[PDB]
Short mmCIF file of all heavy atoms in Angstrom, two decimals:
data_model
loop_
_atom_site.label_atom_id
_atom_site.label_comp_id
_atom_site.label_asym_id
_atom_site.label_seq_id
_atom_site.Cartn_x
_atom_site.Cartn_y
_atom_site.Cartn_z
N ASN A 1 -4.66 -5.61 7.69
CA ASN A 1 -3.91 -5.16 6.47
C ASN A 1 -2.96 -6.16 5.94
O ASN A 1 -2.67 -7.14 6.62
CB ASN A 1 -3.18 -3.86 6.86
CG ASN A 1 -4.12 -2.67 7.13
OD1 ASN A 1 -4.93 -2.33 6.24
ND2 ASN A 1 -4.14 -2.19 8.31
N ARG A 2 -2.39 -5.84 4.81
CA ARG A 2 -1.51 -6.74 4.12
C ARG A 2 -0.19 -7.02 4.86
O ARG A 2 0.66 -6.10 5.08
CB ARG A 2 -1.16 -6.09 2.73
CG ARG A 2 -0.28 -6.88 1.78
CD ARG A 2 -0.05 -6.07 0.55
NE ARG A 2 1.07 -6.61 -0.28
CZ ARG A 2 2.23 -6.12 -0.47
NH1 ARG A 2 2.55 -4.93 0.10
NH2 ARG A 2 3.07 -6.70 -1.27
N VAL A 3 -0.01 -8.25 5.22
CA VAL A 3 1.18 -8.72 5.97
C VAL A 3 2.22 -9.43 5.08
O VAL A 3 3.37 -9.18 5.21
CB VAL A 3 0.76 -9.58 7.20
CG1 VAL A 3 1.93 -10.22 7.83
CG2 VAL A 3 -0.01 -8.77 8.16
N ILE A 4 1.71 -10.29 4.15
CA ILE A 4 2.56 -11.10 3.31
C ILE A 4 2.47 -10.57 1.91
O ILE A 4 1.43 -10.16 1.46
CB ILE A 4 2.17 -12.59 3.42
CG1 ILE A 4 2.66 -13.20 4.74
CG2 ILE A 4 2.72 -13.36 2.21
CD1 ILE A 4 1.73 -14.31 5.26
N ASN A 5 3.60 -10.50 1.25
CA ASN A 5 3.68 -10.26 -0.21
C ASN A 5 3.26 -11.56 -0.97
O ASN A 5 4.03 -12.46 -1.03
CB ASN A 5 5.08 -9.80 -0.57
CG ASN A 5 5.16 -9.54 -2.10
OD1 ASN A 5 4.21 -9.67 -2.84
ND2 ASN A 5 6.37 -9.29 -2.53
N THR A 6 2.00 -11.60 -1.52
CA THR A 6 1.55 -12.70 -2.22
C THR A 6 1.93 -12.75 -3.73
O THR A 6 1.44 -13.61 -4.43
CB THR A 6 -0.02 -12.71 -2.15
OG1 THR A 6 -0.57 -11.43 -2.55
CG2 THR A 6 -0.45 -13.07 -0.73
N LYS A 7 2.77 -11.83 -4.17
CA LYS A 7 3.04 -11.73 -5.58
C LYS A 7 4.55 -11.61 -5.94
O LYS A 7 4.93 -11.13 -6.94
CB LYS A 7 2.35 -10.55 -6.14
CG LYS A 7 0.78 -10.61 -6.11
CD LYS A 7 0.07 -9.46 -6.70
CE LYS A 7 0.37 -8.17 -6.04
NZ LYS A 7 -0.57 -7.06 -6.48
N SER A 8 5.36 -12.06 -4.98
CA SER A 8 6.84 -12.25 -5.26
C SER A 8 6.98 -13.50 -6.13
O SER A 8 6.97 -14.62 -5.66
CB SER A 8 7.59 -12.41 -3.98
OG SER A 8 7.05 -13.39 -3.11
N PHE A 9 7.14 -13.31 -7.45
CA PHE A 9 7.19 -14.45 -8.43
C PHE A 9 8.58 -15.08 -8.45
O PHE A 9 8.70 -16.19 -9.04
CB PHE A 9 6.83 -13.92 -9.81
CG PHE A 9 5.57 -13.28 -9.88
CD1 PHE A 9 5.48 -11.85 -10.06
CD2 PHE A 9 4.31 -13.87 -9.72
CE1 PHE A 9 4.28 -11.20 -10.18
CE2 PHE A 9 3.13 -13.26 -9.74
CZ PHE A 9 3.10 -11.90 -10.02
N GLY A 10 9.61 -14.45 -7.87
CA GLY A 10 10.93 -15.12 -7.81
C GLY A 10 11.52 -15.37 -9.15
O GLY A 10 12.36 -16.31 -9.25
N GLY A 11 11.11 -14.68 -10.20
CA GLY A 11 11.58 -15.00 -11.55
C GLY A 11 11.03 -16.25 -12.14
O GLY A 11 11.47 -16.58 -13.21
N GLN A 12 10.13 -16.98 -11.44
CA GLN A 12 9.51 -18.15 -12.05
C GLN A 12 8.39 -17.72 -12.93
O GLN A 12 7.74 -16.70 -12.79
CB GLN A 12 9.04 -19.10 -10.96
CG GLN A 12 10.16 -19.61 -10.07
CD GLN A 12 9.65 -20.59 -9.03
OE1 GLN A 12 8.53 -21.10 -9.13
NE2 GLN A 12 10.48 -20.83 -8.04
N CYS A 13 8.06 -18.59 -13.92
CA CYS A 13 6.87 -18.47 -14.75
C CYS A 13 5.92 -19.56 -14.39
O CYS A 13 5.67 -20.59 -15.10
CB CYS A 13 7.29 -18.51 -16.23
SG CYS A 13 5.84 -18.32 -17.39
N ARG A 14 5.40 -19.47 -13.14
CA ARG A 14 4.56 -20.53 -12.58
C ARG A 14 3.08 -20.30 -12.95
O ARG A 14 2.25 -19.81 -12.22
CB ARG A 14 4.67 -20.54 -11.06
CG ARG A 14 4.19 -21.79 -10.35
CD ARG A 14 4.40 -21.69 -8.90
NE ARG A 14 3.77 -22.74 -8.10
CZ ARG A 14 3.66 -22.66 -6.80
NH1 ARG A 14 4.02 -21.66 -6.03
NH2 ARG A 14 3.10 -23.73 -6.18
N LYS A 15 2.76 -20.71 -14.22
CA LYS A 15 1.40 -20.69 -14.71
C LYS A 15 0.55 -21.73 -14.06
O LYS A 15 0.97 -22.83 -13.82
CB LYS A 15 1.36 -20.76 -16.20
CG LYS A 15 1.95 -19.60 -17.01
CD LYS A 15 2.31 -19.93 -18.37
CE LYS A 15 1.16 -20.38 -19.27
NZ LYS A 15 1.55 -20.77 -20.64
N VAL A 16 -0.72 -21.39 -13.81
CA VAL A 16 -1.83 -22.38 -13.56
C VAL A 16 -2.96 -21.98 -14.37
O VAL A 16 -3.34 -20.81 -14.49
CB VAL A 16 -2.19 -22.40 -12.09
CG1 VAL A 16 -2.77 -21.07 -11.62
CG2 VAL A 16 -3.22 -23.54 -11.84
N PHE A 17 -3.60 -23.02 -15.10
CA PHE A 17 -4.88 -22.83 -15.67
C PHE A 17 -5.92 -23.01 -14.66
O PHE A 17 -6.04 -24.02 -14.02
CB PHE A 17 -5.02 -23.83 -16.81
CG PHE A 17 -6.34 -23.65 -17.58
CD1 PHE A 17 -6.57 -22.49 -18.28
CD2 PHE A 17 -7.26 -24.66 -17.55
CE1 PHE A 17 -7.76 -22.37 -19.02
CE2 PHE A 17 -8.43 -24.51 -18.23
CZ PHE A 17 -8.68 -23.39 -18.94
N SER A 18 -6.86 -21.99 -14.52
CA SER A 18 -7.83 -22.06 -13.48
C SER A 18 -8.97 -23.05 -13.74
O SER A 18 -9.66 -23.48 -12.79
CB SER A 18 -8.46 -20.61 -13.37
OG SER A 18 -9.40 -20.61 -12.26
N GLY A 19 -9.12 -23.40 -15.01
CA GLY A 19 -10.20 -24.38 -15.32
C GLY A 19 -11.53 -23.87 -15.10
O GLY A 19 -12.28 -23.59 -16.10
N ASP A 20 -11.97 -23.69 -13.84
CA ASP A 20 -12.89 -22.67 -13.50
C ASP A 20 -12.34 -21.26 -13.94
O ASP A 20 -11.12 -21.10 -13.89
CB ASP A 20 -13.15 -22.67 -11.98
CG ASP A 20 -14.07 -21.55 -11.54
OD1 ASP A 20 -14.99 -21.26 -12.29
OD2 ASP A 20 -13.86 -20.95 -10.42
N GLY A 21 -13.23 -20.38 -14.35
CA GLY A 21 -12.79 -19.14 -14.87
C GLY A 21 -12.09 -19.19 -16.21
O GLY A 21 -11.90 -18.14 -16.83
N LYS A 22 -11.69 -20.41 -16.66
CA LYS A 22 -11.19 -20.61 -18.01
C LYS A 22 -10.07 -19.57 -18.37
O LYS A 22 -10.12 -19.03 -19.53
CB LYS A 22 -12.35 -20.46 -18.95
CG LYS A 22 -13.34 -21.57 -18.77
CD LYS A 22 -14.61 -21.60 -19.65
CE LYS A 22 -14.38 -20.74 -20.89
NZ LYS A 22 -15.52 -20.93 -21.80
N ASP A 23 -9.10 -19.37 -17.49
CA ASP A 23 -8.04 -18.41 -17.67
C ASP A 23 -6.76 -18.91 -16.99
O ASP A 23 -6.83 -19.78 -16.19
CB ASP A 23 -8.45 -17.00 -17.09
CG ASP A 23 -7.58 -15.91 -17.69
OD1 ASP A 23 -6.71 -16.20 -18.54
OD2 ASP A 23 -7.71 -14.74 -17.25
N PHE A 24 -5.68 -18.36 -17.42
CA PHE A 24 -4.37 -18.67 -16.84
C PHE A 24 -3.98 -17.58 -15.90
O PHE A 24 -4.08 -16.36 -16.17
CB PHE A 24 -3.27 -18.84 -17.92
CG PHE A 24 -3.39 -20.03 -18.75
CD1 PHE A 24 -4.27 -20.06 -19.89
CD2 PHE A 24 -2.69 -21.18 -18.46
CE1 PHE A 24 -4.34 -21.21 -20.59
CE2 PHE A 24 -2.79 -22.32 -19.19
CZ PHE A 24 -3.66 -22.35 -20.29
N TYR A 25 -3.52 -17.96 -14.71
CA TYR A 25 -3.00 -17.05 -13.67
C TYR A 25 -1.60 -17.33 -13.29
O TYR A 25 -1.21 -18.56 -13.32
CB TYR A 25 -3.92 -17.08 -12.50
CG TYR A 25 -5.39 -16.76 -12.78
CD1 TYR A 25 -6.38 -17.65 -12.51
CD2 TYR A 25 -5.74 -15.56 -13.44
CE1 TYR A 25 -7.65 -17.40 -12.81
CE2 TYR A 25 -7.04 -15.30 -13.72
CZ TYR A 25 -7.97 -16.18 -13.40
OH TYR A 25 -9.30 -15.89 -13.68
N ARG A 26 -0.89 -16.36 -12.89
CA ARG A 26 0.57 -16.53 -12.41
C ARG A 26 0.58 -16.53 -10.93
O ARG A 26 0.30 -15.53 -10.24
CB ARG A 26 1.42 -15.37 -12.99
CG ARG A 26 2.92 -15.57 -12.77
CD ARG A 26 3.70 -14.55 -13.47
NE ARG A 26 5.14 -14.65 -13.24
CZ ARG A 26 6.06 -13.76 -13.48
NH1 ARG A 26 5.73 -12.62 -14.01
NH2 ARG A 26 7.35 -13.97 -13.19
N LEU A 27 0.97 -17.67 -10.28
CA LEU A 27 1.18 -17.73 -8.93
C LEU A 27 2.55 -17.16 -8.54
O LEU A 27 3.51 -17.07 -9.31
CB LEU A 27 1.14 -19.20 -8.44
CG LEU A 27 -0.18 -20.00 -8.66
CD1 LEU A 27 -0.03 -20.74 -9.92
CD2 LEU A 27 -0.37 -20.94 -7.53
N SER A 28 2.66 -16.74 -7.26
CA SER A 28 3.94 -16.40 -6.75
C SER A 28 4.78 -17.65 -6.70
O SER A 28 4.29 -18.78 -6.70
CB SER A 28 3.82 -15.81 -5.22
OG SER A 28 3.44 -16.81 -4.38
N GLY A 29 6.11 -17.37 -6.63
CA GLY A 29 7.07 -18.50 -6.63
C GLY A 29 7.04 -19.36 -5.37
O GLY A 29 7.52 -20.47 -5.41
N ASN A 30 6.61 -18.78 -4.25
CA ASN A 30 6.63 -19.48 -2.98
C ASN A 30 5.34 -20.03 -2.38
O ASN A 30 5.39 -20.76 -1.39
CB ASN A 30 7.24 -18.52 -1.92
CG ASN A 30 6.38 -17.21 -1.73
OD1 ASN A 30 5.80 -16.81 -2.71
ND2 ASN A 30 6.44 -16.72 -0.57
N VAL A 31 4.14 -19.72 -3.04
CA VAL A 31 2.98 -20.27 -2.46
C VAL A 31 2.93 -21.73 -2.54
O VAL A 31 3.20 -22.35 -3.65
CB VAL A 31 1.77 -19.59 -3.15
CG1 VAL A 31 1.60 -20.15 -4.58
CG2 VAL A 31 0.48 -19.81 -2.42
N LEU A 32 2.58 -22.41 -1.49
CA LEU A 32 2.65 -23.89 -1.43
C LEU A 32 1.55 -24.48 -2.26
O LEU A 32 1.81 -25.48 -2.95
CB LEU A 32 2.48 -24.41 0.02
CG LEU A 32 3.71 -24.42 0.90
CD1 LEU A 32 3.43 -24.74 2.27
CD2 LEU A 32 4.78 -25.37 0.38
N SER A 33 0.36 -23.92 -2.30
CA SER A 33 -0.59 -24.31 -3.31
C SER A 33 -1.65 -23.28 -3.49
O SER A 33 -1.90 -22.53 -2.63
CB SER A 33 -1.27 -25.68 -3.01
OG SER A 33 -1.95 -26.17 -4.09
N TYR A 34 -2.29 -23.29 -4.70
CA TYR A 34 -3.47 -22.50 -4.95
C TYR A 34 -4.35 -23.23 -5.95
O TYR A 34 -3.87 -23.45 -7.09
CB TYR A 34 -3.08 -21.11 -5.50
CG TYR A 34 -4.20 -20.05 -5.43
CD1 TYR A 34 -4.26 -19.12 -4.47
CD2 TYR A 34 -5.19 -20.04 -6.38
CE1 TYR A 34 -5.24 -18.20 -4.40
CE2 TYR A 34 -6.22 -19.11 -6.36
CZ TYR A 34 -6.20 -18.20 -5.32
OH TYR A 34 -7.18 -17.19 -5.31
N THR A 35 -5.59 -23.64 -5.66
CA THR A 35 -6.35 -24.54 -6.44
C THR A 35 -7.77 -24.12 -6.54
O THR A 35 -8.25 -23.32 -5.67
CB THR A 35 -6.32 -25.96 -5.86
OG1 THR A 35 -6.89 -25.96 -4.53
CG2 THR A 35 -4.91 -26.48 -5.79
N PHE A 36 -8.50 -24.49 -7.63
CA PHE A 36 -9.77 -23.91 -7.99
C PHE A 36 -10.89 -24.96 -8.11
O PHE A 36 -11.86 -24.73 -8.82
CB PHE A 36 -9.64 -23.16 -9.31
CG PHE A 36 -8.58 -22.15 -9.36
CD1 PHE A 36 -7.28 -22.47 -9.79
CD2 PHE A 36 -8.86 -20.87 -9.09
CE1 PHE A 36 -6.30 -21.45 -9.84
CE2 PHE A 36 -7.84 -19.84 -9.12
CZ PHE A 36 -6.62 -20.24 -9.59
N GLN A 37 -10.84 -26.07 -7.36
CA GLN A 37 -12.03 -26.94 -7.36
C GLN A 37 -13.02 -26.26 -6.46
O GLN A 37 -12.81 -25.61 -5.46
CB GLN A 37 -11.64 -28.30 -6.85
CG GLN A 37 -11.11 -28.55 -5.52
CD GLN A 37 -10.80 -29.93 -5.19
OE1 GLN A 37 -11.27 -30.89 -5.79
NE2 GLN A 37 -10.00 -30.21 -4.11
N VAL A 38 -14.35 -26.45 -6.88
CA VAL A 38 -15.50 -25.76 -6.34
C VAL A 38 -16.28 -26.58 -5.42
O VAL A 38 -16.46 -27.79 -5.67
CB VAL A 38 -16.39 -25.17 -7.53
CG1 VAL A 38 -17.72 -24.81 -7.03
CG2 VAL A 38 -15.68 -24.02 -8.15
N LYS A 39 -16.81 -25.98 -4.35
CA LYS A 39 -17.83 -26.62 -3.54
C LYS A 39 -18.97 -25.72 -3.30
O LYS A 39 -18.86 -24.51 -3.27
CB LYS A 39 -17.32 -27.09 -2.11
CG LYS A 39 -16.05 -27.93 -2.11
CD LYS A 39 -15.87 -28.52 -0.75
CE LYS A 39 -14.61 -29.29 -0.63
NZ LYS A 39 -14.42 -29.93 0.75
N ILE A 40 -20.19 -26.29 -3.14
CA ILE A 40 -21.40 -25.51 -2.88
C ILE A 40 -22.21 -26.18 -1.75
O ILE A 40 -22.27 -27.40 -1.66
CB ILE A 40 -22.33 -25.46 -4.13
CG1 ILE A 40 -21.50 -25.16 -5.43
CG2 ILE A 40 -23.41 -24.36 -3.93
CD1 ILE A 40 -20.98 -23.74 -5.46
N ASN A 41 -22.72 -25.35 -0.84
CA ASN A 41 -23.58 -25.84 0.29
C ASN A 41 -24.81 -24.97 0.33
O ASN A 41 -24.72 -23.73 0.33
CB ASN A 41 -22.90 -25.79 1.58
CG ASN A 41 -21.82 -26.87 1.74
OD1 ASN A 41 -20.99 -27.03 0.84
ND2 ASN A 41 -21.89 -27.57 2.83
N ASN A 42 -26.00 -25.58 0.35
CA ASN A 42 -27.29 -24.89 0.48
C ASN A 42 -28.07 -25.58 1.63
O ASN A 42 -28.10 -26.83 1.72
CB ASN A 42 -28.09 -25.03 -0.82
CG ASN A 42 -29.45 -24.32 -0.75
OD1 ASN A 42 -29.57 -23.08 -0.35
ND2 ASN A 42 -30.51 -25.09 -1.00
N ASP A 43 -28.70 -24.78 2.49
CA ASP A 43 -29.65 -25.16 3.52
C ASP A 43 -30.88 -24.33 3.46
O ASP A 43 -30.74 -23.11 3.66
CB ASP A 43 -28.99 -25.11 4.91
CG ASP A 43 -27.81 -26.02 4.98
OD1 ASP A 43 -27.51 -26.75 4.10
OD2 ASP A 43 -27.13 -26.07 6.13
N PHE A 44 -32.06 -25.00 3.30
CA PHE A 44 -33.33 -24.34 3.54
C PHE A 44 -34.03 -24.81 4.74
O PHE A 44 -33.97 -26.00 5.11
CB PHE A 44 -34.39 -24.61 2.36
CG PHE A 44 -34.33 -23.52 1.31
CD1 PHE A 44 -33.19 -22.95 0.85
CD2 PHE A 44 -35.51 -22.99 0.85
CE1 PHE A 44 -33.13 -21.97 -0.08
CE2 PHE A 44 -35.52 -21.94 -0.09
CZ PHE A 44 -34.30 -21.42 -0.54
N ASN A 45 -34.61 -23.90 5.55
CA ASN A 45 -35.51 -24.15 6.62
C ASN A 45 -36.86 -23.37 6.52
O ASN A 45 -36.90 -22.25 6.99
CB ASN A 45 -34.92 -23.83 7.94
CG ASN A 45 -33.81 -24.81 8.29
OD1 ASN A 45 -33.34 -25.51 7.43
ND2 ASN A 45 -33.45 -24.88 9.54
N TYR A 46 -37.83 -23.95 5.75
CA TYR A 46 -39.24 -23.47 5.77
C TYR A 46 -39.98 -23.95 6.96
O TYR A 46 -39.89 -25.14 7.32
CB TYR A 46 -39.98 -23.85 4.51
CG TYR A 46 -39.69 -23.10 3.16
CD1 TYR A 46 -38.44 -22.69 2.87
CD2 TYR A 46 -40.72 -23.04 2.23
CE1 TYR A 46 -38.24 -21.99 1.71
CE2 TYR A 46 -40.50 -22.35 1.05
CZ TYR A 46 -39.30 -21.86 0.78
OH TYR A 46 -38.99 -21.18 -0.43
N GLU A 47 -40.75 -23.09 7.60
CA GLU A 47 -41.55 -23.45 8.76
C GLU A 47 -42.73 -22.52 8.79
O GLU A 47 -42.61 -21.26 8.79
CB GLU A 47 -40.74 -23.32 10.08
CG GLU A 47 -39.44 -24.00 10.01
CD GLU A 47 -38.74 -24.04 11.33
OE1 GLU A 47 -39.21 -23.42 12.30
OE2 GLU A 47 -37.69 -24.73 11.42
#
């Protein structure tokens, strides 16, 4: 269950543009980082 409050904004207006998702999101005032670069991994094994 929920241990940390991830949405205490501390009165900051800490906007990030997601780039991915093409939208703006408000981070909490204390999160050290939140970033949206994407990675993909695929593995096939035909036999």
